[PDB]
From a paper:
The enzyme 2,3-bisphosphoglycerate-dependent phosphoglycerate mutase (PGAM) catalyzes the interconversion of 3-phosphoglycerate and 2-phosphoglycerate, a key step in the glycolytic pathway. As a key enzyme in glycolysis and energy metabolism, PGAM is a potential target for novel antibiotics.
The dicarboxylic acid adopts a bound conformation that places one carboxylate group in the carboxylate-binding pocket formed by Thr21 and Gly22, while the other carboxylate group is oriented towards His9 near the positively charged region responsible for binding the transferred phosphate. This structure was obtained from a different crystal form that was grown from 2.4 M sodium malonate. The alternate crystal packing in the malonate-grown crystals coincided with a significant shift of the α-­helix containing residues Arg114 and Arg115 relative to its position in the P1 crystal form. The inclusion of two metabolite-like fragment structures in the ensemble (2-phosphoserine and malonate) provides starting points for elucidating ligand-binding flexibility and potential for small-molecule inhibitor design.
Numbering used by the authors:
A (entry chain B): 1 to 229
B (entry chain A): 0 to 244
The structure:
Amino acid sequence: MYKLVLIRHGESTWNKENRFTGWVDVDLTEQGNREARQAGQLLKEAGYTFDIAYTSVLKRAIRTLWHVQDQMDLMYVPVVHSWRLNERHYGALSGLNKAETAAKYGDEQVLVWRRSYDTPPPALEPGDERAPYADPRYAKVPREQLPLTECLKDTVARVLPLWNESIAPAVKAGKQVLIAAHGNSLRALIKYLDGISDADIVGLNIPNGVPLVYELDESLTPIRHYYLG
Amino acid sequence: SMYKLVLIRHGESTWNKENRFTGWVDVDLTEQGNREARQAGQLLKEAGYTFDIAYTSVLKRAIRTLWHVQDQMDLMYVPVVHSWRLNERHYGALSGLNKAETAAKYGDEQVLVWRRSYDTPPPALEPGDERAPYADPRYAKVPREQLPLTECLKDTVARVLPLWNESIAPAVKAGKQVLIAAHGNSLRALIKYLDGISDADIVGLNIPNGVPLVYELDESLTPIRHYYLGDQEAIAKAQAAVAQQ
Ligand code: NA
């Protein structure tokens, strides 16, 4: 029996505005700060501790992790910041709210995108300000691996290598691991962990700033999972 | 080639403000300390500095100072190495005691020996003291016999330098832009080694809280010069204040 803890970042400014964010590096709102501190308090009171954390390169997830670390008195543990835990890339939808998206692309195409595991939204132009190529976060990432858009299938494909490379060996080694990330990168892990179908994973809701605990057997197969609080 | 190395002592801590020996006790920043650290980050950002990696201690006053700097510079994603080897000098049984009350009790000379004798440590913690480091998860990978119950600066130098030799110096040599966010005595220890300062002279080195301290090093990592970032007159005032304590 191992335990692995997952948590989605607290409310971001763009969550509050119901805007597609993706790789845009927006910060937490004060509510998102509170959710993160509350999650830290919950893990602490329920007797959790961690040896290492994995997070993305996006500050909304990183700041969530900082609050959890702060509240648990774990500010000293090693942290890995991986672009592979970034939120799904939403291409040209990044920055649009629901009304704006419906207006530009029409309801039917939005419905197809919302439902389709393997159809990506319109891509960023490679020269768009929002493209990742000039960003110092991705300086060592092979250029061809950087997305200008992603369907959820793409997101899953680039999240999952972190499982065999890093998370599973750490868990098997007896490390107490925390993963502080984003709705869709957490979906990718959960998709693999619980063997969820392409069709069902699309609808899985994960709330901001609530610790999600997986209990795993010797083979890293889930026994059960639950949210704290 | 010239390399730039940035050092910073933690922002004002609660026990700096209360005038208490701290050592390895894991106290936090005051609001002033938070402001110093944010200002430090703003200054570094405005002066066009960036970092590939930061080294810090396992103590939250230094780590939170680093976090403010990372926050202000938009560098929250960069690699950070947290090492007990950058901890403040271990203050032994003095840890938690008021400096004035201690001087009243044991005399000024005796406290000054404990504070600044290069090679004579403060009285040791008893190993069964709750303040001893043995059950602390921060030190669980440190062999028991290497964990101090007290340190003089000389001891602090011996435990700081292997991190410089094995990790930090190679990273500077490789052209990485390094920030070290640490503590008064662990920074004095490293600087003692970098500037080749004598045992008697290192005594007077006074590093202000929360001020970026830039070293320019040549190809062999020998300092060309160092200087502090920010309001130079305010920094001189802060230096006078540290020296008086
Ligand atoms: Na300690």
